[PDB]
Design a protein around this ligand. Sequence first.
Ligand SMILES: [Ca+2]
Ligand SMILES: [Ca+2]
Ligand SMILES: [Ca+2]
Ligand SMILES: [Ca+2]
Ligand SMILES: [Ca+2]
Ligand SMILES: [Ca+2]
Ligand SMILES: [Ca+2]
Ligand SMILES: [Ca+2]
Ligand SMILES: [Ca+2]
Ligand SMILES: [Ca+2]
Ligand SMILES: [Ca+2]
Ligand SMILES: [Ca+2]
Ligand SMILES: [Ca+2]
Ligand SMILES: [Ca+2]
Ligand SMILES: [Ca+2]
Ligand SMILES: [Ca+2]
Ligand SMILES: [Ca+2]
Ligand SMILES: [Ca+2]
Ligand SMILES: [Ca+2]
Ligand SMILES: [Ca+2]
Ligand SMILES: [Ca+2]
Ligand SMILES: [Ca+2]
Ligand SMILES: [Ca+2]
Ligand SMILES: [Ca+2]
Ligand SMILES: [Ca+2]
Ligand SMILES: [Ca+2]
Ligand SMILES: [Ca+2]
Ligand SMILES: [Ca+2]
Ligand SMILES: [Ca+2]
Ligand SMILES: [Ca+2]
Ligand SMILES: [Ca+2]
Ligand SMILES: [Ca+2]
Ligand SMILES: [Ca+2]
Ligand SMILES: [Ca+2]
Ligand SMILES: [Ca+2]
Ligand SMILES: [Ca+2]
Ligand SMILES: [Ca+2]
Ligand SMILES: [Ca+2]
Ligand SMILES: [Ca+2]
Ligand SMILES: [Ca+2]
Ligand SMILES: [Ca+2]
Ligand SMILES: [Ca+2]
Ligand SMILES: [Ca+2]
Ligand SMILES: [Ca+2]
Ligand SMILES: [Ca+2]
Ligand SMILES: [Ca+2]
Ligand SMILES: [Ca+2]
Ligand SMILES: [Ca+2]
Ligand SMILES: [Ca+2]
Ligand SMILES: [Ca+2]
Ligand SMILES: [Fe+3]
Ligand SMILES: [Fe+3]
Ligand SMILES: [Fe+3]
Ligand SMILES: [Fe+3]
Ligand SMILES: [Fe+3]
Ligand SMILES: [Fe+3]
Ligand SMILES: [Fe+3]
Ligand SMILES: [Fe+3]
Ligand SMILES: [Fe+3]
Ligand SMILES: [Fe+3]
Ligand SMILES: [Fe+3]
Ligand SMILES: [Fe+3]
Lengths: 172, 172, 172, 172, 172, 172
Amino acid sequence: TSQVRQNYHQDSEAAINRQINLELYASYVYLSMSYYFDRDDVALKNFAKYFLHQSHEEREHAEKLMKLQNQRGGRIFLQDIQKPDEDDWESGLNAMEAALHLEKNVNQSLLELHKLATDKNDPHLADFIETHYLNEQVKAIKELGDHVTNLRKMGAPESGLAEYLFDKHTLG
Amino acid sequence: TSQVRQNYHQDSEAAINRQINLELYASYVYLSMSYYFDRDDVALKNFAKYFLHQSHEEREHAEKLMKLQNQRGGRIFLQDIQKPDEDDWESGLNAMEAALHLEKNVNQSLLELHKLATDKNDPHLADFIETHYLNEQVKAIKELGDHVTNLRKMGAPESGLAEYLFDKHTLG
Amino acid sequence: TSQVRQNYHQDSEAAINRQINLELYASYVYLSMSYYFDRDDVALKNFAKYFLHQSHEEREHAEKLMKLQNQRGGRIFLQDIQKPDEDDWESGLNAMEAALHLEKNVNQSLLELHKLATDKNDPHLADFIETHYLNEQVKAIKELGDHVTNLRKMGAPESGLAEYLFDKHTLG
Amino acid sequence: TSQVRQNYHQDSEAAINRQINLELYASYVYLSMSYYFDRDDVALKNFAKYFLHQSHEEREHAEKLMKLQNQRGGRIFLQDIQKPDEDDWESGLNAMEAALHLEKNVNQSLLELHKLATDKNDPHLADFIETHYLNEQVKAIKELGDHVTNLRKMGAPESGLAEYLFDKHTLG
Amino acid sequence: TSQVRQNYHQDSEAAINRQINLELYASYVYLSMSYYFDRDDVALKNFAKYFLHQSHEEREHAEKLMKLQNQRGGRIFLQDIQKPDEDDWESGLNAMEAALHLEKNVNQSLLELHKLATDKNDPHLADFIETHYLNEQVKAIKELGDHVTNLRKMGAPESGLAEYLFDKHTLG
Amino acid sequence: TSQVRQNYHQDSEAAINRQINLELYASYVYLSMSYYFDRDDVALKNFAKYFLHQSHEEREHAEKLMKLQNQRGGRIFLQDIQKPDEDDWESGLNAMEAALHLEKNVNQSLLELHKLATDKNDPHLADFIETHYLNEQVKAIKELGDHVTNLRKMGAPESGLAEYLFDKHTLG
Ligand SMILES: [Ca+2]
Ligand SMILES: [Ca+2]
Ligand SMILES: [Ca+2]
Ligand SMILES: [Ca+2]
Ligand SMILES: [Ca+2]
Ligand SMILES: [Ca+2]
Ligand SMILES: [Ca+2]
Ligand SMILES: [Ca+2]
Ligand SMILES: [Ca+2]
Ligand SMILES: [Ca+2]
Ligand SMILES: [Ca+2]
Ligand SMILES: [Ca+2]
Ligand SMILES: [Ca+2]
Ligand SMILES: [Ca+2]
Ligand SMILES: [Ca+2]
Ligand SMILES: [Ca+2]
Ligand SMILES: [Ca+2]
Ligand SMILES: [Ca+2]
Ligand SMILES: [Ca+2]
Ligand SMILES: [Ca+2]
Ligand SMILES: [Ca+2]
Ligand SMILES: [Ca+2]
Ligand SMILES: [Ca+2]
Ligand SMILES: [Ca+2]
Ligand SMILES: [Ca+2]
Ligand SMILES: [Ca+2]
Ligand SMILES: [Ca+2]
Ligand SMILES: [Ca+2]
Ligand SMILES: [Ca+2]
Ligand SMILES: [Ca+2]
Ligand SMILES: [Ca+2]
Ligand SMILES: [Ca+2]
Ligand SMILES: [Ca+2]
Ligand SMILES: [Ca+2]
Ligand SMILES: [Ca+2]
Ligand SMILES: [Ca+2]
Ligand SMILES: [Ca+2]
Ligand SMILES: [Ca+2]
Ligand SMILES: [Ca+2]
Ligand SMILES: [Ca+2]
Ligand SMILES: [Ca+2]
Ligand SMILES: [Ca+2]
Ligand SMILES: [Ca+2]
Ligand SMILES: [Ca+2]
Ligand SMILES: [Ca+2]
Ligand SMILES: [Ca+2]
Ligand SMILES: [Ca+2]
Ligand SMILES: [Ca+2]
Ligand SMILES: [Ca+2]
Ligand SMILES: [Ca+2]
Ligand SMILES: [Fe+3]
Ligand SMILES: [Fe+3]
Ligand SMILES: [Fe+3]
Ligand SMILES: [Fe+3]
Ligand SMILES: [Fe+3]
Ligand SMILES: [Fe+3]
Ligand SMILES: [Fe+3]
Ligand SMILES: [Fe+3]
Ligand SMILES: [Fe+3]
Ligand SMILES: [Fe+3]
Ligand SMILES: [Fe+3]
Ligand SMILES: [Fe+3]
């Protein structure tokens, strides 16, 4: 056993490895979305910038979980990062809806991880998840919902003018 | 023969003279486009500024080729600069489409020039073209494609509101 | 008729289009002269800089006429820019003499344009020409005459030392 | 066909998609290496920092290829990012040797890509690879070789003192 | 074989060793020229400074090739640096003509090296030569040609006044 | 005879030409040593920097002797710069020992030159050698001896850790 390990259940260690993979997955989904908006036939540069920023932030989230695993004396086991479920994200609205769905799935996983931590009487892990992940997820979901609402109300995706103006005035 | 001339084929020298003319031609097309948008019945001042900038940059491109000709010991032979193929460019979208077509033609000429240089084992000329022209052409073409896509998606040219807003938010 | 057009004769509009072409022509002559002095077998870099500056200023003069045409509600019709009457300008003195001849021809055209404006009772156009072109032409002609005189008195073109020293001390 | 596409072969487009995956793979290998050195039973924080830096730089390399694909009018098709071939990298020396092997494999792929570009007479792509990838690979390989040599000469991996001191004085 | 070596032909390695010697040779020729102009019976201090600068730059060029050899995993084999073909360089004009001849010979060698690199499908080496040597050679040759032309036109070498004034106004 | 020459014996002039060659030789030995330490299988970057610095300083020493020759009205006659007596310098310790041996040989030559100057009652030359060369040689020899002693005491060359640490803490 690692000399630092204390009050850290095998199941928690495994769940942290799964969460690392999920954050890396989310980073990859956002990378895909970003460069879709960089296509010459899509050409929404602030959508592209927005999603690239999200990609980089998800990598930071994954790295912090890798740090956590080592802090607690668990051992990192990486898995393949699955490619996303689309190559063509269709529109700004559709991408925002897919991001909302992704973030709700990441949140569900984090909530299950918190539940596990508290079932295993691991208050350090539970508060790590609280403090560094749960409110960031609520904020992310709220922002994506706000963006979806605005794009819908403006007439996206059929209005390319709506997506253009949202790109300029909200994301720029 | 010029005292500086070395490894510089007659055919390359001729092709550089043709390229000088083509860059000067492109400068003139953009000058024409610029002042079309300055007309009182068109009145898109950032389209005008955009194309004037492009005009001046094309002149810089031509001057650099004239410098190259002399660097290599070739001799500059200028030809008439043909007037453009339109006097009235119709709309912001139509002008952007014509600019895209122009830039692809300039690129085709540059690619043929690179091919000539490498057929004549002139690596200085090939890398001059690479380094100073080819990526600038890819960037120019990508930008014009992006602009065309946005104007189309916004509803141009029938939407004069689309062209107005693109002028303000992309070109301004 | 353009909504802005007022007191602007068809003949004046045509003459402005001709003048645009002449200023663009002068720009091209000076461009040619500039790079002649950049040849390795001529190699007078301040003659080259002088004439490149003149080239760029002539383009500014043309652009201001294009602006004028649109200000008055005329319509710009561009024509080919003829290549210059020489490829090899022979010497610094000979180029200065050709520039003097060019500027006197441009001045003659501007004077005819002023005469037309006043015959058509177009005081805006007459004072535009006065204010922005006529004294600039007198200054240009005087400077070129001064340069020709100095080069002749110094012994140019047979004295390559004269042209060298004029390049350094007058044009540098 | 994309409106921007010109002189861009299907095979080149496919090879760029493969290269994107390889750069993302390299980023993941370096991420794995980094956090191995963050383990409490390894505890070489400058090895960890070094490899994290490399991870982030490889992601930048991948993003630039994604930009290139879109610049040329190709279409990005992402694939899974395979997990690395080790979970436990054994030592500082062993990790540096694995990084050297990785970088030589990435270089081999880039060289094949350059060969393809030149076989398809795509000088823009060939010079993109030259300019942005090939010398960076030679530098990376040289640095890793230098590091391997020093660690070997110092007595690594059996000397944990050697790895400690290399971490402080070369990587810190 | 060196652990870093990849795609680096024996013939290329040998040619780089020859090029190192040639750049060191050029450095020595320029050193000789410099101090000729420092003689009390020659006494052209800006010719001396010009050629000393060139000497030091050629040493930098040689050092960069030595770095390249090691970057690629080749092995440096130095050879004697031959003394120059003159002790007395006769005049400023004659020295400039000898420098022009030298630089054209160095260029010829670099062009053969580029040809070798591309025959051996070594795009890193070909672009190293392009990027760091070929345009620097074209610029050097153009400058020397310009200097030769001016000195000839001014009346050198028989006019010691010409050489004096060129020393002051071009090289000073 | 040169108009400046006074109290300057033919033998002294010849000895200065020999000394110029010896300083250039020393510069070349140090250049060789420098890049040996830049090899990927040697990889001691501060040894490399140290010896490159010495190379450049020896060139300065040679240039000052060339200046001296001309100051006194002697005539510079350059000779080939012999390549060094090794291609592979084996180790940091071995290179330092070879440098010590070189510097003692240069010193011996300078001492013979001083003896010649004083035998020919040339106090300017004797004090030039004193003032600009003799103490610099004593300092150089002392430093190299100090370096040799430290490397020996630390366990070089068999301890690659010793050479690594000396590179960091003495030469870095
Ligand atoms: Ca435990
Ligand atoms: Ca457990
Ligand atoms: Ca686990
Ligand atoms: Ca899969
Ligand atoms: Ca799927
Ligand atoms: Ca699917
Ligand atoms: Ca589907
Ligand atoms: Ca909050
Ligand atoms: Ca030739
Ligand atoms: Ca030919
Ligand atoms: Ca021609
Ligand atoms: Ca025509
Ligand atoms: Ca027509
Ligand atoms: Ca027509
Ligand atoms: Ca028509
Ligand atoms: Ca290149
Ligand atoms: Ca780019
Ligand atoms: Ca009217
Ligand atoms: Ca009328
Ligand atoms: Ca008209
Ligand atoms: Ca014509
Ligand atoms: Ca004619
Ligand atoms: Ca004629
Ligand atoms: Ca004629
Ligand atoms: Ca008035
Ligand atoms: Ca005045
Ligand atoms: Ca194509
Ligand atoms: Ca194809
Ligand atoms: Ca593909
Ligand atoms: Ca797998
Ligand atoms: Ca495995
Ligand atoms: Ca395995
Ligand atoms: Ca195994
Ligand atoms: Ca480098
Ligand atoms: Ca090889
Ligand atoms: Ca071989
Ligand atoms: Ca060899
Ligand atoms: Ca010899
Ligand atoms: Ca001889
Ligand atoms: Ca001889
Ligand atoms: Ca002879
Ligand atoms: Ca240049
Ligand atoms: Ca004497
Ligand atoms: Ca004597
Ligand atoms: Ca002698
Ligand atoms: Ca020898
Ligand atoms: Ca030997
Ligand atoms: Ca031997
Ligand atoms: Ca031996
Ligand atoms: Ca002292
Ligand atoms: Fe997020
Ligand atoms: Fe996340
Ligand atoms: Fe352009
Ligand atoms: Fe262009
Ligand atoms: Fe003028
Ligand atoms: Fe004018
Ligand atoms: Fe890397
Ligand atoms: Fe990479
Ligand atoms: Fe040079
Ligand atoms: Fe050189
Ligand atoms: Fe020394
Ligand atoms: Fe010395």
